[PDB]
C-alpha cells in the first residue's frame, strides 16, 4: 500500500524517510550559497535574489555567525535555517561555559547534526 509519506518518522518499504526527502526539495527550490575551504580558513557566499528595487540594498543579510569564529550559510526555508543557528549559538555557549575554549568545528557540526537528525525521529 501507500501513505508512507504522510508522517515524518515512517520508514518506507525501501527504507527511506520520505518527509526528509520532500524537505530536500524545499531546499533545491532555493537560492545558492557555497563554501570554499582554503589554506587557513573558509569562505562563504550566497546568492541573494533581488525580488524588487523596493528592497533596501545590502540589508537583508543572510550569512550568520555562530559565536565569533563560525560562519553559517544555508539555502532553503530561511526560517528553518535561522532556527538551526539559534540552537547552534546555544550549543556553542553551553560548550564554552563548561570548557572555556570556543567550540571546535567538528564538535560544532556534530551538535548540529544531532539536532537535525533528531527531527527525523518523531
Amino acid at each position: 500500500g501507500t501513505g508512507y509519506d504522510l508522517s515524518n518518522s515512517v520508514f518506507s518499504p525501501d527504507g527511506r524517510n520520505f518527509q526528509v526527502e520532500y524537505a530536500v526539495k524545499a531546499v533545491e527550490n532555493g537560492t545558492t550559497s557555497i563554501g570554499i575551504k582554503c589554506n587557513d580558513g573558509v569562505v562563504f557566499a550566497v546568492e541573494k535574489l533581488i525580488t524588487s528595487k523596493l528592497l533596501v540594498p545590502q540589508k537583508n543579510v543572510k550569512i550568520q555567525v555562530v559565536d565569533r569564529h563560525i560562519g553559517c550559510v544555508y539555502s532553503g526555508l530561511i526560517p528553518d535555517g535561522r532556527h538551526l543557528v539559534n540552537r547552534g549559538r546555544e550549543e556553542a555557549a553551553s560548550f564554552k561555559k563548561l570548557y572555556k575554549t570556543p567550540i571546535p568545528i567538528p564538535a560544532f557540526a556534530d551538535r548540529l547534526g544531532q539536532y537535525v537528525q533528531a527531527h527525523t525521529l518523531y
Binding site: K59, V61, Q64, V65, D67, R68, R89, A93, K97
Partner: protein, 233 residues
C-alpha cells in the same frame, strides 16, 4: 547566602572634561593573606567602557564571562555591531545593575561593588556604580571600599560638582587618581602596590595602562619615631 572568599579591594574613578579614568590594584586577598598578585580587576568592554569590580573574585570572574557573552551575542545578526549598535556603557551598566538586584532579591548575591566607566556614542562621560544589593548611583567621582573613604575626599577636591568637570584635564585627573592610589597603599592593609589604570577619552578613545606602581613614597620620616610616648631612644 554566601560569604566572600578571595577578594579585591577599592576601585576608584572620576570623570573629567572629555572622558573618565578608573583604577584598581592587582591583588586578590584571602582574608589577611595577600594571596594573588596578578589580578586584573579592570574589565574593558569594547572600545568605550571599562568596568571595575571589587568584592569576591570568583563572582568577578563570573561577571567577566557574562560580559564577554554580552559582547558575543550583540554581534549576532547585528550588521552594526562594530558601530551604531555597539555596546554603550549605559547598556552594560543597566544590564549589570539588573543582575545584581535580581541576585540580591533571590538572596544569592554577587558579592561585588562595581563601577562602570565609559563614554557614550554622543560623547558624554558615563560613570556609575551598582553593588551586591542593587543600589546604584552616579557622581563626578566614585570609589568602592576604602576608596570611598579616602579617595573620594581627595578626588572631590578637584571635581566638587558637575561644573568642574569641563575645567579638569586628563593630566590633572590622572595625577589625582595616582595619588589616591598611593594613599590607599599607605592606609589600606589590603592594598597592593601594583595597579591598573584606564582612561576613556572622547578623542583618544580607550587607553588602558597595565603594571603601574605607587612611587614618590614618603617613609623617611619613620626614623625619628621611637617608643609610644615617654621613650627617649
Amino acid at each position: 547566602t554566601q560569604q566572600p572568599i578571595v577578594t579585591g579591594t577599592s576601585v576608584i574613578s572620576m570623570k573629567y572634561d572629555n572622558g573618565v579614568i578608573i583604577a584598581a590594584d592587582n591583588l586578590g586577598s584571602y582574608g589577611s593573606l595577600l594571596r594573588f598578585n596578578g589580578v586584573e580587576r579592570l574589565i574593558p568592554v569594547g572600545d568605550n567602557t571599562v568596568v571595575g569590580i571589587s568584592g569576591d573574585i570568583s563572582d568577578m570572574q563570573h561577571i567577566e564571562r557574562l560580559l564577554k557573552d554580552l559582547v558575543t551575542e550583540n554581534a549576532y545578526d547585528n550588521p552594526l555591531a562594530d558601530a551604531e549598535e555597539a555596546l554603550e556603557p549605559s547598556y552594560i551598566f543597566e544590564y549589570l545593575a539588573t543582575v545584581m538586584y535580581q541576585r540580591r532579591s533571590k538572596m544569592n548575591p554577587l558579592w561585588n561593588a562595581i563601577i562602570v566607566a565609559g563614554v557614550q556614542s554622543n560623547g558624554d562621560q558615563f560613570l556609575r556604580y551598582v553593588n551586591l544589593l542593587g543600589v546604584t548611583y552616579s557622581s563626578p567621582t566614585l570609589a568602592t571600599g576604602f576608596g570611598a573613604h579616602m579617595a573620594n575626599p581627595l578626588l572631590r577636591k578637584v571635581v566638587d560638582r558637575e561644573s568642574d568637570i569641563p575645567k579638569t584635564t586628563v593630566q590633572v585627573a590622572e595625577e589625582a587618581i595616582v595619588n589616591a592610589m598611593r594613599v590607599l597603599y599607605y592606609r589600606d592593609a589590603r592594598s597592593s602596590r601594583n595597579f591598573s589604570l584606564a582612561i576613556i577619552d572622547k578623542n583618544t578613545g580607550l587607553t588602558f595602562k597595565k603594571n603601574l606602581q605607587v612611587e614618590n613614597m614618603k617613609w623617611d620620616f619613620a626614623k625619628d619615631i621611637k617608643g609610644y610616648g615617654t621613650q627617649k631612644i
